[PDB]
Amino acid sequence: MELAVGIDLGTTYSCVGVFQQGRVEILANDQGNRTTPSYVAFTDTERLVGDAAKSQAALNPHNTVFDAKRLIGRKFADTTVQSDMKHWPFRVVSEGGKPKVRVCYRGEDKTFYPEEISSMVLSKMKETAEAYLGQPVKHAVITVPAYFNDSQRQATKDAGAIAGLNVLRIINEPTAAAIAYGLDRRGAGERNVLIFDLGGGTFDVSVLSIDAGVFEVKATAGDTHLGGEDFDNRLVNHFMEEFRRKHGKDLSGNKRALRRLRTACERAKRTLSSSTQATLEIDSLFEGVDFYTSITRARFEELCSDLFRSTLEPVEKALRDAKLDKAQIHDVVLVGGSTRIPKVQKLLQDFFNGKELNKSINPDEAVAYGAAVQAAVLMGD
Ligand SMILES: Nc1ncnc2c1ncn2[C@@H]1O[C@H](COP(=O)(O)OP(=O)(O)O)[C@@H](O)[C@H]1O
Ligand SMILES: [Mg+2]
């Protein structure tokens, strides 16, 4: 009766599914969400993980950790680590050439390796599954980006082990998304698959060839610093200029106000994926002044148009590297929460001369969904 789970340990949002009784169930968390921010907050009395960690970042910025995936399996001296450090409000230090994050927890100075932070997220996902299933969960498939190296892969497996999971297999995110749609189980014949994965922090284009169930990654392109959080930042800039005009103050040096604004921006952005208009409502944003306004989809689309358009160059480069024409791609699959933006879908579809996109599985859940299938395969006979 033991079920294994599939876990997407994502840069910004993680997700857990289980293959049970015909179907794959993606599990809702402590606040009812099907994805969970990869955030851990250390307070005076609690260690919070996920949504409650993210929501109290405004008030406790130095002890609220995120982006651990960006440190995992790297050295402190790496140029990408030193660059990313300038943008984080939590301290990163060096221990034996390895990054650790430094925080205050229960009034005490503590340091943790990136795999320890990631194990806390994986422990939450494990317990989330246990609450739903009403039984122990001891086995998992965990996904990683196609470009992860061996030491990044081992360090992710260790995060799993530290969380009490026996890791059945570390599989690539784009391969998991293809498995989610059964693309490796369409009989004989090679197929070429393009995975367009636009997440919260990273953009990944992968060209896969599938034959007799064997996956080969033909090409990858993208940008590790393009994702939903950049669309949030465009909205943040728009609304701080609107706050200036409406209320006569610049809030660009008040970190707390900018963080509260960022939260309200991300919500508004999500609403614009299914409505043409969204309100933005924040009590006491700055010096006790409330900020209540709205924005159209069309205006959000203008604000990010260069960013959206830029996602097509990597698609083209990847196809070039794979030595394929776009008409030779059998399947295009939407992955990542940012591919729920209607304009992003229109841009990709027009690029593929009107080809229908695989998007029936919620793009932010597709990786966990394929991992769940794969975990079931590996538990089987
Ligand atoms: N309905 C939506 N419309 C637009 N963006 C969304 C929507 N839902 C989630 N997102 C965004 O998707 C990103 C999270 O992507 P996801 O794939 O879940 O995580 P990750 O990229 O860490 O794997 C965030 O920027 C989030 O705001
Ligand atoms: Mg992802």
Query: DSSP readout, 286-314?
Result: ETTEEEEEEEEHHHHHHHHHHHHHHTHHH
Give the C-alpha separation, 249 to 287, whole Å.
10
Find the Cα–Cα–Cα–Cα dihedral 377, 37, 76, 102, rounded to 10°. -130
The structure tokens listed for 66 are 């995120």
Q: Do strands 166-172 and 191-198 pair parallel, antiparallel, or not at all (unpaired)?
A: unpaired
| Superfamily per CATH, domain 2-65+121-185+359-379 | ATPase, nucleotide binding domain (3.30.420.40)
Architecture of domain 227-310: Alpha-Beta Complex (3.90)
CA nearest neighbour of 215 among 185, 237, 249: 185
Q: How many other CB atoms are found less than 10 A from the CB of residue 112?
A: 19
Query: Do the annotations mark residue 340 as ligand-binding?
Result: yes
CA distance from start to end of the chain = 14
Give me the CATH code for the 66-120 domain, please: 3.30.30.30
Strand order, beta sheet including 98-105 = 91-95, 98-105, 108-112
Contact 41, 152 (CB under 8 A): no
- Measured N-to-C along each axis, helices 150-162 and 114-133 cross at an angle, to the nearest 10 degrees, of 50
Is 339 touching ligand 1 by the criterion CB < 6 Å?
no
Q: Kindly calculate the radius of gyration of the chain based on its CA atoms and give it in whole angstroms.
A: 21
Residue nearest to atom 22 of ligand 1 (CA): 12
- Does the CB atom of residue 358 touch ligand 1 within 6 A? no
CATH of 186-226+311-358, one of 3.30.420.40, 1.20.1340.10, 3.40.50.10490, 3.40.50.300: 3.30.420.40
Q: Which residues are 277's β-sheet partners?
A: 296
**What's the token pair of residue 250?**
């610049």
320 annotated as ligand-binding: no
Q: Reduced to 3 states, what is the DSSP secondary structure of residue 177? A: helix
Q: List the resolution, Å.
A: 2.2
Q: How many Å separate Cα 247 from the centre of its chain?
A: 35
Residue 186 in tokens: 């369409």
Proximal ligand: closest to the CA of 300: 1
Whole-angstrom Cα distance, residue 163 to residue 188? 40
Annotated domain spans of the chain: 2-65+121-185+359-379, 66-120, 186-226+311-358, 227-310
Extended strands (E) in the chain: 5-8, 13-20, 23-26, 36-37, 40-42, 47-49, 64-65, 91-95, 98-105, 108-112, 139-144, 166-172, 191-198, 203-211, 214-223, 277-286, 289-296, 331-335
Token pair for 67: 């982006």
CA distance 176 to 171: 7
Residue 121 · residue 49 · CB < 8 Å: yes
Q: Measured from the CB, is residue 35 less than 6 Å from ligand 1?
A: yes
280 C-alpha to ligand 2 centroid (Å): 26
Nearest to 163 by CA among 201, 203, 125: 125
Give the whole-angstrom CA distance, residue 6 versus residue 374: 7
Structure tokens at 242: 């609107």
Amino acid at 206: S
